[PDB]
Each structure stands twice: as structure tokens, then as C-alpha cells.
Amino acid sequence: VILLKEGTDSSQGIPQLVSNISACQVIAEAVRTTLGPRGMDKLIVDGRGKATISNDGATILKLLDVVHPAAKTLVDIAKSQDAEVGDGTTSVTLLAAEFLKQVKPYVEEGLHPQIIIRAFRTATQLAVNKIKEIAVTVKKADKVEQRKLLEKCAMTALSSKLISQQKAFFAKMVVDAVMMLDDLLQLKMIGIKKVQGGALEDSQLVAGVAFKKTFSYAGFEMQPKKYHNPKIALLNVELELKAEKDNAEIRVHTVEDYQAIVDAEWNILYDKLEKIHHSGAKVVLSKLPIGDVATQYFADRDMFCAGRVPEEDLKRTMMACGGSIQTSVNALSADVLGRCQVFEETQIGGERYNFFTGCPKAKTCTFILRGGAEQFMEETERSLHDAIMIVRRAIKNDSVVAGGGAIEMELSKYLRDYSRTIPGKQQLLIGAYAKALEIIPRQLCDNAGFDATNILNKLRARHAQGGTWYGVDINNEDIADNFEAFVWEPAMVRINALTAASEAACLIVSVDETIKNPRS
């Protein structure tokens, strides 16, 4: 009798680790061609036939079906970097794969994994410290410069996306959507509504709240679609004929009582509607459905009704107008009904959209983004989420750093200089770490169709002593001061990318043996 169950497959030693490293490079090759302004796009077809088109590391790696545990670790690092700072998902995957590739030569011979793990830990600690101590903060707390910083960070975020040519149009736009948020920066307080048709520059930012026409009954299209100073009655009660309690039983023995009860049901509905009307509100909203009788009742009195609105849209209306949702109708006071400057139902690309615009004190927003195909608008929404996340993270501290591979080259130079004082074998490993951190400008040049080696040598020569902040200028096919070129990134994305890549590299290296069970 054998020790383990039949079909158990075990791999041990150096070849298993080298195969894991190779799997890491193979899985990181799938997102390699999606960096920088000249970044390309990946189309993934599901088993159901639906095709998703995107160029962010997190989404592409998630869509890829991965069963290799090391490639699974790469997928997890990309997804976690997406969930922490939002931007820099491809950088973490490329950095991890490049660390592993740079060290695999040293692991081919008998190098103990603990020493290279320690080398990674020291190198990444020094790198994070250098990034913290190099990033510049204006420390002025002035609105104009804060707006410029956020606009430039958003613009740099929109590059390498489908919305590149309209960066300036969208970037400042999302900045406004973060300007008008409270001191909690909740991501549910800015909505994104996608509608077919129209150009990319036809998108708009509603400072109140806009949502698609939910439903209508026989009686709609009669109440007016334009009010100039209305009061919104946010509600949570269905206004329609129904059973009182879903188990209430009526027991009577006279026709007079029967007629009285029928009139009583009608009377309770009409009294509820009368309370709503006498509240002074002109347009009413409800999570629960609104029946046809209430639709006709509000049509007969120049009042707008809208039932079955989504929960999130109703809460956004709460945060825009400034009301409160009442499940009960007996207490429609005057300080609970929200008010807006203009309400208007308009036609957008074959659909009807309700707009509440002009709210003076608005803590919410709505994105009406246009496009030609569902994947077009979905990718636009992905890019916009990237930008709003980067602005949301950067609003806590306006410490920035030059992008375009400038920070990677600066850390590479710092680590190269540091790995000369340290004696022994750790010098070679830290040098390997720096040469690996040298990957981002090379890949940017490769995607831009440059002479990667020539530009890298120029960067190294100009950046050993000629000054920091120098990255790759794609348009000029050369090197340039990316900080003076307004290519800015918050330092937290690079810090998180470096620490996550180090953690994943240590986890991959620290494995000596793997076991696969017969998966009963």
C-alpha cells in the first residue's frame, strides 16, 4: 500500500522552482504590451461568447483562467494592487516577473532561497524609504495648485487608455466629481450611467442626479416634464391597491360593510396620496412600485411620479437634494422634502433620463458617458474609475513623483550605488534587484517602438549625475524631464507596487515543493 492517495503528483527541488518562475514570466507576458501612451488593447472572449476589451493588468489577469499557483500569485498581486490604490496593476505584475527573471540565473546554481529573500526585503525597504524621501509635496494648501495637481494626476492616469485623446476633457471633469464629495470620499456617491449613441466628447457630469426612466403606467406622459423649483418627496412606500398585511382576513356578513370596506381601501389610498400632495412636494420618488391609480392621481394635479427607482439612485438623490427617505406617510414635514433648482426629463440616445440639476449643496454626482458600443463605454467607465480612484487617493496627500520610468531609474541608480558598499554576495542580488527595477522604461520604449537599449543608456548616463525626474518622452522619441513635462503620479502607487512585488517574489521563491491531490 502506497503512502498517499493514487494520482498525487509532487514536484521538489530546483526544477520545480525554475518552472514556477517561468510560469510567472509567461503569465506576466499576457499584459506586457499594455503600458504607456502607446499601450495596446486586449480582447478576451469568454466561454459564453461575450468579449471584454481592456488594457489594465487587473481586469486582463482576472479574465484569464489561471490554474498555476505561481501565476495565481501574480493574479492576486494584480488584483490586490487594483483594490488598494486602483492604478498600477500592470506595473506590479511586470516587476514581480522581472525580479524572478533576474534572480533565476542565481537560483540555477545552489543559492539558498532565504538569502535572496532577505536581499529582496532589504532592497524593497530601502526603495520605499527613498520614494518617501524623494517625492515632493507643495505644502501650500492653496486651491488653484491643488486643482492643478489633481488635474495633472488624472490626465496622467487617462493616458494609456481608450480616452487618451480626450484626457483634458475627462480629467478635470472627474476632479469636479471629487471636489463636490464630502469628507468621506465614498465611491457610491458618484454614479456612472452608460447610454449608447453619441460621441466621446458628448459625455457630461450632472452635478445633481440623473437616472434612466424606471417605468410608467397608463397615466404617464400627462404630468409635466419640467418644474422650475420643485420639492422632491423621497419615499419607500408603494402607492397602489394591495392587501393590508399579506395575511389580513376580512370577515363581514352585510353588504353595507362590504361596500364600506371597499370604499375604505380606496379612502386609505387616497388619504396617503393626499398627505403626499399636501406636503407641498411636486415630484415624488419611491423604491417600491407606484400603481396606475397614483400615476393618474398625480397626473390630475400636475405632479410627477417615478416608482421602482434603484436604492443607490435614491440615496444619490438624497445626497444631492438634501432630503430623507420616509417609509411612513403620516409625517411629511417641510424639512424632509428635498428641493432642486431644475427637474427635467430628457431624451438621450433612445432612452428617457430624469435629471435633477442645480442643487446648491450637492454631495453627489452622476456621469452620463457616451459611446458607440457597450464595450466602448465599459472601457471608458474602467478608465474613469481608475482616474477617480487616483484622485481620491491623491486628495489625502499631494505628494507626487515624476512618471514615465523616471522613478524606476532613480531607484535603480540608488540601489546600484548602495550595492557597492555592501560586501559579499548580497551585492550581486541587490544589483539584480536594481537591474530588474530597470524594466519599466524598457517596456515603455518597446511598446512605443523605440530603440530601447539606446534610450536606456541615455537615461542611465543623463541620470547618474545629470539630474533626477528624467523619464522617456514618447512623442519626442527621446528622454525628457517628466516632472517639468507634467507627468505626475502619487508616490503611493509606486510604494505599493514595490512592496507588493517584493512580497510576491518572496512568496514564490520560498517554495521548495508542491503537491497536487486527485481533486476528488
Partner: protein, 525 residues
């Protein structure tokens, strides 16, 4: 090492296309779609006969509809279908134009990238040329008057739109009914047109000439209890929701009849309930009653012997349209039916449609009716469907002209003028990016070529001659003489395209081709 490692689940069957070969495949599929859509373009174009999986057939020229029913599997073809549908949604006209423009742009992009130029550079050049073309298109446009007093420019635009479709057999009354329907329904103060107030209804039989515009409501019902008169004169109507049945609470209930006296009381209550229902219908004075939810035999007979015709089972949207047309109010209970809540009807008539048993009612209004109805008649179901989609195209053009007011002189003149502007701008541009601009110019200028080829003329020579005419005399309204009436000038021929339609075409095609060029890798099972 010797061992081959597996990373992706089920990776032995997945397929991957990478690099320039994938872009070649994309461009090839787009070219195939554009070539399919090329023939059915312009007045001389020919329809396409689409049959669905159920086997039912439809003959149509609407590019958006053709591509929507095109059961296609390639992802690029799916993107082209979405392009056409979105162009239909935003504008309603030029659905084939966007497809043809995208195909031409992708073909020029293929020619360019054969010379080792980056796809993103091609996309940037396309964007710059699109900006130049849109600016020139806004510069070249002139405006028409959207008013009832002088409606003729609206007829000209609708007649230009209705060209290249079977309804051009009439080609004059179709434009008239489209313009009248949109003008009546439109809310001019808000410059908004609601398409729910135009109940486009069709029925086989008759001729395409019989398609009329009722300034009222047509409904596919008949007078219940046929003994009642088949038509009434100008009548007061009572739009109603509750059925003519004894009431019952929504809450579950039990009525215990514990004695014979209780039984007699219940009988009397039901009978007197019917009687009081009819009496309080009659007391308001309405001649015609309309109920959404139908009713029973006793209500029929009481309505008949009280000289009050009525119909039942009218749908919700039909109830709303009737009440809007007649000016009345929908009331959900008999106890709140006042004189003010009735509507007015110019005349309510019943029509039989020949030997068939089918019947319909027409309600004609003597007052202002915000709602209308386009009634279509023809000899085929295919003719009816094509006619109604063509009239939807005309209505979309009319409302687009209401909301924008600016027009350009189509027939290829707009494309040629934009091409000249693009080329002139690309002249004074630094190299490495003028190639994309000239490719954009040629790609947008293929539209006159396809128009002339469909017209039977030699494309290249005629296109070159008309372009030379446009550049010699500064008359940017010279287009392909597709109908062969001479007069390359397109002002006299009265061809009108909407400015927003053409600019949307250009922008949407440019964005779609940018997305297509952006794609690099394909992984599919």
C-alpha cells in the same frame, strides 16, 4: 527543463492571435462587413432579404436593422453591428454610412501599417482629421426654418431621407405625413419630440397610397355588443380604468351569508350596483364609454339599452393616447366621474378592412390633439414593415432637424468638401502624421465613389470631375448626380442631410475605428 508546464485551465484548445496578424484579421472582417453594406447605399441601392432562425423573411434597406439581424460570430463584426445600432439610436439616419466609413478607414489603416507605422499614430491622425472635418462641416452648413407656416424645407429633408427606400414609390405623401406627425407631437418650447405619441400602426391590404395620418387615435377593437351603432358623431367620452363589475377589496375577504335574508340582500346589492353604475355613467352625459379591463354581459345590455356605445379591453398605452387626444382624464372609479373629466371626440367610427372579420375604431378630434397616429397599408407584410421603419427614419430626421435646425447639402457634396478641407490642412502639416490625414480624406471620400458605382456611372472619373468642379468654383454643394437629372449642383435637386447626422457619423466612425486599431491580442476558445 524537459517537463512542459501548464498555467491556464483548458489551455490545449484555446486560440491566440497576436501582433500584426490579429490587426490584419480585424481589418479583413471590417472590410467584409463594409463590402456587404456598400451595395445598399444611395437612391440606386438595392434591398437585402434577411431571414431569421424561425424562417420568417423581411426585405429591408435600413443598415442598422440589416446588421442587427445579421447573425454573425466575429467580434469585429459584432462591434460594427453595435456601431450601426448606436448610430441609429443617436440620429436615426445614416446607419450604413458609418459602417462604410469605418470599413474605408480601416482599409486605409491597413495600407498605412503595411509601411510599419504604429496603429496609435494612425488613430491620432484619424482623430485630428475628424476634428478638421467636423469644423469644416459646421462651417459649411446652412439653416432651415422649423415652422408650420413654411414647412417646405421639412418636406425637402424628409423626401431626401425617404429616398433609397421602397416608400419612394409615393415619396411625397410619406414626407408630408412624417412632417405633420412630428410637428403636431413636438413640444416646441422644450424642443423635444416624444415618440410614444406617434402610434405607428400597420395593416395589410389596400395600397401604399392609403397610408394616412389620423389626428386622433386608431385602435384594434370593436364595439362590444354589436347591436350598438357603428359610429357616433362628436361625442363626449369617458376614459375609464375600473371594469364594469361589482367591486371587491384587494385584501382577501370572506362575506358570510348566514341567512336567506342575507342572500336576498346580496342579490339586491349586486343588481342595484349594476343599475347605479349605469345611472352614474349616464348622468355625466357621455355618449361613449371606454374601459381598459373589460366587463360582462349585464353591463353590455345596460349600456346598449341606454343608447351609450362603449368598447372594452383597451390597452394601457392606448388608454393614455385616447385620453391625451380627447383631452379627458383617466378616472379609476365611477364615483368620481364629473362633467369636466370627459373628453371630446370629433367622431368615433368603425372600419371593417374588406372581407376580413377584423375591425378597428378611429377617433378623430375637432380640437387640439397632442397625439397622432400613422396608419400604413400595403400588399405585403414585408412592405408594411419596411414602410414603418422608413417612416421611423423620416420622423427621426424631422425631430433631429427640430433640435438642431442646421443642414448640409448631401449626395456626396458634404463628404467631398470635408475631404478637400482635410487634404488642405494635411498639406501644411509636418510629416510622419500627414499620411493618416490623407488616408482619412480618401476613406471619407470613398462615399461618393460607392454612390456613383451604385448609380451605374464610372466612380473614379465622375468623382474626380465633381471634385474639380467643387475646387474651381467655390460651390461646395456639388454632388453625385445619382438620379441622372444633370445639374451636379445639389441645391436645385433639393437634397438635405442633417448636420448632426453627418457629424455624428464622422465622430462615431472615428471612435469605433480607433478602438479597433487599439486592439492587439485575441484569446478565444
Amino acid at each position: 527543463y524537459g517537463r512542459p508546464f501548464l498555467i491556464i485551465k483548458d489551455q490545449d484548445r484555446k486560440s491566440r492571435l497576436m501582433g500584426l496578424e490579429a490587426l490584419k484579421s480585424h481589418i479583413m472582417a471590417a472590410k467584409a462587413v463594409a463590402n456587404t453594406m456598400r451595395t445598399s447605399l444611395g437612391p440606386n441601392g438595392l434591398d437585402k432579404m434577411m431571414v431569421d432562425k424561425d424562417g420568417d423573411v423581411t426585405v429591408t434597406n435600413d443598415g442598422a436593422t440589416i446588421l442587427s439581424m445579421m447573425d454573425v460570430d466575429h467580434q469585429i463584426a459584432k462591434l460594427m453591428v453595435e456601431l450601426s445600432k448606436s448610430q441609429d439610436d443617436e440620429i436615426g439616419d445614416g446607419t450604413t454610412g458609418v459602417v462604410v466609413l469605418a470599413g474605408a478607414l480601416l482599409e486605409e489603416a491597413e495600407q498605412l501599417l503595411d509601411r510599419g507605422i504604429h496603429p496609435i499614430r494612425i488613430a491620432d491622425g484619424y482623430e485630428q482629421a475628424a476634428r478638421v472635418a467636423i469644423e469644416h462641416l459646421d462651417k459649411i452648413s446652412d439653416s432651415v426654418l422649423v415652422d408650420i407656416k413654411d414647412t417646405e424645407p421639412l418636406i425637402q429633408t424628409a423626401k431626401t431621407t425617404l429616398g433609397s427606400k421602397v416608400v419612394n414609390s409615393c415619396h411625397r405623401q410619406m414626407a408630408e405625413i412624417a412632417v405633420n406627425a412630428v410637428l403636431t407631437v413636438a413640444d416646441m418650447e422644450r424642443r423635444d419630440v416624444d415618440f410614444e405619441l406617434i402610434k405607428v400602426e400597420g395593416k395589410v391590404g389596400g395600397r401604399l397610397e392609403d397610408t394616412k395620418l389620423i389626428k386622433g387615435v386608431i385602435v384594434d377593437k370593436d364595439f362590444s355588443h354589436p347591436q350598438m351603432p357603428k359610429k357616433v358623431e362628436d361625442a363626449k367620452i369617458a376614459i375609464l380604468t375600473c371594469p364594469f363589475e361589482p367591486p371587491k377589496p384587494k385584501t382577501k375577504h370572506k362575506l358570510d351569508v348566514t341567512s336567506v335574508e342575507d342572500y336576498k340582500a346580496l342579490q339586491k346589492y349586486e343588481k342595484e350596483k349594476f343599475e347605479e353604475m349605469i345611472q352614474q355613467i349616464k348622468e355625466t352625459g357621455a355618449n361613449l364609454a371606454i374601459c381598459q379591463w373589460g366587463f360582462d354581459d349585464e353591463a353590455n345590455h345596460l349600456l346598449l339599452q341606454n343608447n351609450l356605445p362603449a368598447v372594452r379591453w383597451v390597452g394601457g398605452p392606448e388608454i393614455e393616447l385616447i385620453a391625451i387626444a380627447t383631452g379627458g382624464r383617466i378616472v379609476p372609479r365611477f364615483s368620481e366621474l364629473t362633467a369636466e373629466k370627459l373628453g371630446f371626440a370629433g367622431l368615433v367610427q368603425e372600419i371593417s378592412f374588406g372581407t376580413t372579420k377584423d375591425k378597428m375604431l378611429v377617433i378623430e378630434q375637432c380640437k387640439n390633439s397632442r397625439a397622432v397616429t400613422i396608419f400604413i397599408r400595403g400588399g405585403n407584410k414585408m412592405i408594411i414593415e419596411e414602410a414603418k421603419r422608413s417612416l421611423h427614419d423620416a420622423l427621426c430626421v424631422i425631430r433631429n432637424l427640430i433640435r438642431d435646425n442646421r443642414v448640409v447639402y448631401g449626395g456626396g457634396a458634404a463628404e467631398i468638401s470635408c475631404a478637400l478641407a482635410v487634404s488642405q490642412e494635411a498639406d501644411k502639416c509636418p510629416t510622419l502624421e500627414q499620411y493618416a490625414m490623407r488616408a482619412f480624406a480618401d476613406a471619407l471620400e470613398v462615399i461618393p465613389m460607392a454612390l456613383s458605382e451604385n448609380s451605374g456611372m464610372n466612380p473614379i472619373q465622375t468623382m474626380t470631375e465633381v471634385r474639380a468642379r467643387q475646387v474651381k468654383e467655390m460651390n461646395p454643394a456639388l454632388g453625385i448626380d445619382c438620379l441622372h437629372k444633370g445639374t451636379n449642383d445639389m441645391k436645385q435637386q433639393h437634397v438635405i442631410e442633417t448636420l448632426i447626422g453627418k457629424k455624428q457619423q464622422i465622430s462615431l466612425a472615428t471612435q469605433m475605428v480607433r478602438m479597433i486599431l487599439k486592439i492587439d491580442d485575441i484569446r478565444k476558445p
